[PDB]
Write an enzyme that holds these catalytic residues in place. Sequence first.
Site, PDB file in Angstrom:
ATOM      1  N   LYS A   1      -3.213  35.480   9.609  1.00 12.91           N
ATOM      2  CA  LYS A   1      -3.060  36.819   9.075  1.00 12.91           C
ATOM      3  C   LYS A   1      -1.886  36.792   8.112  1.00 12.91           C
ATOM      4  O   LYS A   1      -1.048  35.894   8.164  1.00 12.91           O
ATOM      5  CB  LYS A   1      -2.844  37.820  10.212  1.00 12.91           C
ATOM      6  N   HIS A   2      -1.838  37.762   7.209  1.00 14.20           N
ATOM      7  CA  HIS A   2      -0.782  37.772   6.208  1.00 14.20           C
ATOM      8  C   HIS A   2       0.577  37.991   6.852  1.00 14.20           C
ATOM      9  O   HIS A   2       0.718  38.770   7.797  1.00 14.20           O
ATOM     10  CB  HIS A   2      -1.045  38.849   5.162  1.00 14.20           C
ATOM     11  N   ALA A   3       1.584  37.292   6.335  1.00  9.57           N
ATOM     12  CA  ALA A   3       2.949  37.503   6.789  1.00  9.57           C
ATOM     13  C   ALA A   3       3.382  38.926   6.472  1.00  9.57           C
ATOM     14  O   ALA A   3       2.916  39.537   5.510  1.00  9.57           O
ATOM     15  CB  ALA A   3       3.892  36.502   6.127  1.00  9.57           C
TER      16      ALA A   3
ATOM     17  N   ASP B   1      -1.972  33.245   3.544  1.00  6.13           N
ATOM     18  CA  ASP B   1      -1.241  33.395   2.295  1.00  6.13           C
ATOM     19  C   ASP B   1      -1.453  32.245   1.321  1.00  6.13           C
ATOM     20  O   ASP B   1      -0.807  32.223   0.272  1.00  6.13           O
ATOM     21  CB  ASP B   1       0.255  33.540   2.581  1.00  6.13           C
TER      22      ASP B   1
END
Lengths: 533, 533
Positions: free
Chosen positions: A173-175, A184
């Site tokens: 999942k995106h930071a 990312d």
Amino acid sequence: AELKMDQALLLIHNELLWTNLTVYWKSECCYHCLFQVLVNVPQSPKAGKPSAAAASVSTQHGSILQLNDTLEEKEVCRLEYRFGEFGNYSLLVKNIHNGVSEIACDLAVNEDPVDSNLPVSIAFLIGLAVIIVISFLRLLLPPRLRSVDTFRGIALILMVFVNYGGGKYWYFKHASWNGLTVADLVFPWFVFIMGSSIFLSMTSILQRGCSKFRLLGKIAWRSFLLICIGIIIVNPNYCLGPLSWDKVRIPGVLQRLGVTYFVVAVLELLFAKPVPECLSLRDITSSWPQWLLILVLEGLWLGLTFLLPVPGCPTGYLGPGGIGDFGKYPNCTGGAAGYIDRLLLGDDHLYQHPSSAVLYHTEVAYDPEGILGTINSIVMAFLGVQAGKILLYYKARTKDILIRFTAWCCILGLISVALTKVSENEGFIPVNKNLWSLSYVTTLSSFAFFILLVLYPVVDVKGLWTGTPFFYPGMNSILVYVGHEVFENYFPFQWKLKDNQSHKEHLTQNIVATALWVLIAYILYRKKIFWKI
Amino acid sequence: AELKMDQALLLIHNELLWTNLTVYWKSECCYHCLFQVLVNVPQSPKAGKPSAAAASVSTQHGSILQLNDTLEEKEVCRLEYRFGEFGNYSLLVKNIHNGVSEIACDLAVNEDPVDSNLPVSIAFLIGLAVIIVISFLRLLLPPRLRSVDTFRGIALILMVFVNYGGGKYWYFKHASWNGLTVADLVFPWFVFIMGSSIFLSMTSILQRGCSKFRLLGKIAWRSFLLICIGIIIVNPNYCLGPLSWDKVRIPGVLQRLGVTYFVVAVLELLFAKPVPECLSLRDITSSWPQWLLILVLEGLWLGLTFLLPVPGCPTGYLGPGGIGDFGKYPNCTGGAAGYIDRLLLGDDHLYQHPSSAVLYHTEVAYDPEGILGTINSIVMAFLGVQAGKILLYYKARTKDILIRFTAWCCILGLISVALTKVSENEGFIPVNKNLWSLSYVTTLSSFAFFILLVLYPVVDVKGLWTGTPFFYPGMNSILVYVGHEVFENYFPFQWKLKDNQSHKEHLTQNIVATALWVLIAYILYRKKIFWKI
Ligand SMILES: CC(C)(COP(=O)(O)OP(=O)(O)OC[C@H]1O[C@@H](n2cnc3c(N)ncnc32)[C@H](O)[C@@H]1OP(=O)(O)O)[C@@H](O)C(=O)NCCC(=O)NCCS
Ligand SMILES: CC(C)(COP(=O)(O)OP(=O)(O)OC[C@H]1O[C@@H](n2cnc3c(N)ncnc32)[C@H](O)[C@@H]1OP(=O)(O)O)[C@@H](O)C(=O)NCCC(=O)NCCS
Ligand SMILES: *[C@@H]1O[C@H](CO)[C@@H](O[C@@H]2O[C@H](CO)[C@@H](O)[C@H](O)[C@H]2NC(C)=O)[C@H](O)[C@H]1NC(C)=O
Ligand SMILES: *[C@@H]1O[C@H](CO)[C@@H](O[C@@H]2O[C@H](CO)[C@@H](O)[C@H](O)[C@H]2NC(C)=O)[C@H](O)[C@H]1NC(C)=O
Ligand SMILES: *[C@@H]1O[C@H](CO)[C@@H](O[C@@H]2O[C@H](CO)[C@@H](O)[C@H](O)[C@H]2NC(C)=O)[C@H](O)[C@H]1NC(C)=O
Ligand SMILES: *[C@@H]1O[C@H](CO)[C@@H](O[C@@H]2O[C@H](CO)[C@@H](O)[C@H](O)[C@H]2NC(C)=O)[C@H](O)[C@H]1NC(C)=O
Ligand SMILES: CC(C)CCC[C@@H](C)[C@H]1CC[C@H]2[C@@H]3CC=C4C[C@@H](O)CC[C@]4(C)[C@H]3CC[C@]12C
Ligand SMILES: CC(C)CCC[C@@H](C)[C@H]1CC[C@H]2[C@@H]3CC=C4C[C@@H](O)CC[C@]4(C)[C@H]3CC[C@]12C
Ligand SMILES: CC(C)CCC[C@@H](C)[C@H]1CC[C@H]2[C@@H]3CC=C4C[C@@H](O)CC[C@]4(C)[C@H]3CC[C@]12C
Ligand SMILES: CC(C)CCC[C@@H](C)[C@H]1CC[C@H]2[C@@H]3CC=C4C[C@@H](O)CC[C@]4(C)[C@H]3CC[C@]12C
Ligand SMILES: CCCCCCCCCCCCCCCC
Ligand SMILES: CCCCCCCCCCCCCCCC
Ligand SMILES: *[C@@H]1O[C@H](CO)[C@@H](O)[C@H](O)[C@H]1NC(C)=O
Ligand SMILES: *[C@@H]1O[C@H](CO)[C@@H](O)[C@H](O)[C@H]1NC(C)=O
Ligand SMILES: CCCCCCCCCCCCCC
Ligand SMILES: CCCCCCCCCCCCCC
Ligand SMILES: CCCCCCCCCCCCCC
Ligand SMILES: CCCCCCCCCCCCCC
Ligand SMILES: CCCCCCCCCCCCCC
Ligand SMILES: CCCCCCCCCCCCCC
Ligand SMILES: CCCCCCCCCCCCCC
Ligand SMILES: CCCCCCCCCCCCCC
Ligand SMILES: CCCCCCCCCCCCCC
Ligand SMILES: CCCCCCCCCCCCCC
Ligand SMILES: CCCCCCCCCCCCCC
Ligand SMILES: CCCCCCCCCCCC
Ligand SMILES: CCCCCCCCCCCC
Ligand SMILES: CCCCCCCCCCCC
Ligand SMILES: CCCCCCCCCCCC
Ligand SMILES: CCCCCCCC
Ligand SMILES: CCCCCCCC
Ligand SMILES: CCCCCCCC
Ligand SMILES: CCCCCCCC
């Protein structure tokens, strides 16, 4: 159920008689953040009958707990712990009477947690077993560069996996603000590959005698289509209702690709030169106008990021706002990038769910594909153009291509090390996908040059690998992308789960959907159906 | 707002002193229905101060009002009126003292209504003006049958218009139980055209030497694809959530087409004979096994419809249930057809929004594409097969084709007249799209033979018309159908309206969306992109 995914149960028993406890919580991942109240625990009415309260703590990262006497606003004890998913923990707060009047709070595990990452480990082992079985079983029995298609297919498979949920794991999942996860990586790689393809196709077209104005029309048409498909098809959520202008998101992924493609392709078209035929620098020297304009653009990005004054907000601010940076700048998500987006487009035409909203509790709208980061998208695409120039200028000599790829990977890696100081949140420019920072670009382009350094000899020169099964998606990237956007909710990509709080079921569903998209791309390849914008 | 679309405001003033009035309402379209309570009107507290109540009446059809004394359950007065949309009417109930003690209720129009059908009239005039302008302006300056493509394109344009809303007009919408609207024409025409295409393609394939088993595999593959696309792509509403088996609708449009196609195509494959070369009956005589089996199937449909006993429900019931037929059979929607669907599939796998639910207030699930009406779908497709046989057997002679089309149209029209007795709700078998009744099939196939009788000489023989712009959709019917299902909610097919209670705005939106689908089909035709299942 009582517990959600990635949550443990904490029971606080207050044996103190004359103190009211308030418990604050803070994640270790949240950088310079404010403590938030977890649960209020009243005083013990009588000796031997401790007051009890219950709370759910997040188990994704380490936790920091601070128990403060409510009346005196004084700290009783502080505790750092990594709770496990679906665990059952109890925290006992009592005063030790062994010759002292202090308070000692200690944590016990009533019920052991589960191994949250076990499904990922089993999935990797099963995949490796399949690879080994296929390899051994089969062992007992200008054109298109296949390595670029393999690279694009790898990026597409990762993109479909993480966009469909990624198993609901935090590292798929995106930071939140700074750093890198697996989610990312793929967008900068698409920009890099697109730049490489710009050089390859443009050189092929111009050597066959096509005019520059017809090619300019081709570039303009393709950019227009990308931007329109992004705005009208991909961005809106049509499950919520018919499109209304006042809540139309203008930026996005295909809009970024369209603007970056236009700028980089027109820049190469202006100064296009024929490819001529060990110590040479002619791939860099022959395109010095491009390099001069790219450095001017990067200077503009640095100047607007570090020196543009933002009203009621620090100059050079690179943080997320919200509760981050001790809550001093709650409405400053993005710094000058967010300010420019809100000033030129307005909050209603931006992304309403920034990735920082869950960890830093930001309340303003911030768009990761904003206006100011298009400069760094252009820089990434131009680095991809350099990769293509290396491939064509030194096509005869594999040794020259490998040395050039190694040198570019090393230079960009050293720049990333200097900018980040090898840390998530420190460094002059930290890695940030939301800001499309300079160190983000240098880091991901270093990775891309290393990937090409490995894939080119294996897949293109030696022929040890054909690229299966990645080059099948890599040759229908726009179909796969638009397709997984349009058919995200459809069966068999998504069905009703027995348990929505299970990592195993989400992971299985997402792996199956990714494999189905690879199979669709394989079928399209077999029937020779290819679509290009 | 205070009023919705197709609604008027009724104000009742009760000047009677010793009576409590209850007002019941009934539509003239609702056949043998129960009166439903509209509003309760209390007695006048004093002389000269009539009690007032307000209600909204539906203006689509005529209304019947019955004002009953609540205490005595006795009728005061009865009133039949067609209210107009957004009108403001007042109904005064007073006792006339001119030598009598009766009650006289009379209706006055406070505010005039609007012309609801004016947008339709203006749209037709604008379209006719465009046609005249184009015709005059241009006047001053085996292969594929074009008439069958024109017919399929006409059906597709109507289907897209009515599926997208039809302007929210009741006559561009499915009939509640019996009768015909414009929305009820296109599905039988698709079945008819599909049968014609079965004969044309099969004859072409078999004269070129293809084997019957390869053709059987083609038929089975196409039927399987149609059924699967219907179940997985078209039927579910994925805006509501991921697919769950317990609420998967099994029947549908493409499922009906797939089963009908399989049966009719295999039936023609078994008894396929070569086409040989004024008074001849060889197109009917040479296919007597098909006719024998079709009459046996029709006998089965009639027997199960009129003689199968349904538990707790009359035998031979052809009504809607709900409040229809004086509410005596509330749960009997469909008769034996609904009984078979509920017995073999269960209520949860049927259509949850039958068209009778709005007028007759039915509460059970009924599926218009059920199991028992597939027999009549097969009969409709076989009549289409006969149309194709006429086209190929007498291809040389236009006069023979025209006489055969005229004769078939007349015979089927006479059968429809006999069955319906030229009435919506009377007749041995009324026209019913939900039941796919026999008179529905004969009526729509008579229309189809007349359409071919006009289109064949004009478009195919004389060449006076090319079929523009209908043959463009008619050559990509599956793309247009699946496409308008998938992209129904997308812009530019649907946007946010200023007024959702406006016929003009809904009509404009639906016309624009239909024209956009015709344009998409034209673009696909220009680029020679055609998809066939
Ligand atoms: C937009 C997108 C299709 C870009 O495509 P691309 O990388 O330029 O690749 P294309 O298939 O468009 O290639 C265009 C040209 O490059 C050439 N090319 C592409 N791959 C090549 C290869 N391996 N070797 C040689 N030439 C190649 C093609 O021949 C074509 O030339 P032509 O115009 O003369 O036919 C792709 O990046 C995409 O789908 N974007 C998704 C972005 C995304 O998902 N981001 C992550 C967040 S969701
Ligand atoms: C399913 C559907 C595509 C049926 O197709 P169809 O009418 O059989 O037409 P197709 O395009 O499939 O034609 C198939 C064959 O007939 C032939 N054919 C079609 N039109 C023809 C014509 N005008 N002349 C000669 N041959 C023709 C084709 O050549 C093809 O033969 P091949 O398989 O040998 O190539 C179409 O009816 C549909 O889209 N269904 C929608 C149902 C609907 O909307 N109902 C209303 C409620 S929404
Ligand atoms: C819990 O109590 C501690 C006191 O030990 C608080 O720490 C002080 O916070 C104030 C802010 O109100 C600062 O001005 C002091 O410098 C802090 N002192 C120390 C020693 O850290 C702490 O803020 C309280 N927790 C919360 C969440 O408010
Ligand atoms: C978490 O663990 C505690 C154990 O300390 C559980 O509390 C016990 O619950 C059982 C069943 O209700 C009782 O018989 C015990 O007397 C309880 N023990 C104590 C010390 O309270 C608690 O139920 C667990 N919570 C969950 C959600 O499983
Ligand atoms: C309104 O009152 C009339 C009486 O004039 C009702 O008509 C009677 O209804 C009963 C049913 O309860 C029948 O048995 C009678 O035969 C009816 N008589 C006549 C003369 O029609 C009428 O039903 C009432 N309206 C409603 C909606 O109940
Ligand atoms: C429907 O028409 C009646 C007219 O009979 C409207 O009632 C009038 O409303 C105006 C403004 O409120 C008053 O000044 C009049 O005294 C009212 N007349 C009576 C006889 O009551 C009524 O407002 C209209 N309704 C709508 C929704 O427009
Ligand atoms: C020439 C362009 C394309 C590339 C270089 C642009 C640089 C030099 C520009 C872009 C934005 C500019 C800044 C914008 C606003 C301010 C605030 C003011 O109080 C002092 C000048 C200062 C700090 C500017 C300095 C110069 C600057 C940083
Ligand atoms: C034909 C005989 C010699 C068998 C060849 C073995 C093949 C299947 C093996 C040997 C080397 C392997 C490659 C080595 C390194 C990388 C790492 C990563 O970037 C993607 C996979 C990739 C590219 C491997 C894919 C599989 C591979 C190509
Ligand atoms: C031979 C088939 C394919 C075509 C003709 C089928 C007809 C004749 C069949 C189908 C359904 C049958 C009916 C089904 C059930 C009943 C109820 C029973 O109390 C008396 C017989 C009766 C009324 C049957 C009579 C015959 C019937 C009408
Ligand atoms: C070339 C010269 C002679 C001009 C020809 C006039 C054309 C455009 C006119 C004359 C007759 C017309 C047709 C006559 C009847 C029908 C009715 C309906 O079923 C669809 C339209 C259709 C099929 C008409 C379409 C337009 C038409 C073909
Ligand atoms: C991280 C997500 C992993 C998803 C696995 C996708 C790879 C499996 C591909 C299956 C389809 C094979 C088609 C090609 C056959 C030669
Ligand atoms: C009942 C709904 C009416 C919708 C009108 C659709 C017909 C207009 C077609 C416009 C596109 C023209 C493309 C063909 C050009 C030769
Ligand atoms: C703890 O909180 C309760 C809640 O109102 C309050 O009544 C009590 O006085 C508090 N105790 C102390 C010691 O402040
Ligand atoms: C009318 O209805 C009201 C409502 O309760 C009731 O009080 C009154 O008695 C009724 N009048 C007659 C005449 O029945
Ligand atoms: C969250 C930590 C960020 C680290 C950034 C990357 C540091 C390494 C630079 C690239 C090295 C090149 C290897 C291919
Ligand atoms: C065909 C002969 C050469 C003509 C020059 C072509 C230049 C094309 C790029 C310049 C246009 C820039 C638009 C923003
Ligand atoms: C020959 C076809 C020409 C089409 C021109 C379309 C114009 C739109 C240009 C889009 C530019 C987007 C990047 C700023
Ligand atoms: C020799 C053929 C010439 C073809 C001319 C096409 C030119 C299109 C230019 C589009 C420019 C768009 C800039 C935004
Ligand atoms: C905690 C997250 C670990 C993974 C971060 C992503 C960086 C490492 C994987 C990317 C390497 C790509 C090949 C050079
Ligand atoms: C003449 C050269 C033939 C190809 C040799 C390839 C060797 C270099 C591969 C680099 C891979 C680095 C992985 C750590
Ligand atoms: C709602 C009324 C239904 C009427 C059914 C149709 C009656 C006419 C039969 C068909 C006549 C043939 C003309 C082409
Ligand atoms: C190829 C020689 C003739 C063979 C007969 C073909 C018959 C095909 C239809 C029968 C199968 C029915 C399946 C339900
Ligand atoms: C050569 C390809 C053969 C594929 C066979 C598929 C079998 C499914 C049959 C569907 C029949 C549906 C109507 C009852
Ligand atoms: C001469 C080539 C023979 C090809 C054989 C294909 C036969 C497929 C039969 C499918 C039957 C499905 C019935 C439901
Ligand atoms: C009240 C509804 C009027 C329209 C009903 C549909 C029947 C007449 C139109 C169909 C004729 C098709 C050509 C024969
Ligand atoms: C390419 C630009 C498309 C913009 C779409 C605007 C949607 C407007 C909807 C109208 C309702 C307010
Ligand atoms: C519990 C439901 C499991 C569904 C598994 C999906 C399998 C996809 C393959 C079928 C493609 C049409
Ligand atoms: C062609 C048959 C497809 C049937 C689809 C079933 C969907 C099952 C979803 C599983 C969740 C309960
Ligand atoms: C008020 C919004 C009106 C929208 C009109 C739609 C026009 C569609 C043509 C554009 C196709 C992309
Ligand atoms: C079994 C599919 C390949 C491995 C995927 C691993 C995802 C965590
Ligand atoms: C590439 C040089 C970066 C500047 C170093 C910054 C150290 C704080
Ligand atoms: C203006 C488009 C043609 C006419 C459509 C009429 C719909 C009622
Ligand atoms: C085709 C003949 C139908 C039977 C007539 C029914 C009259 C009630």
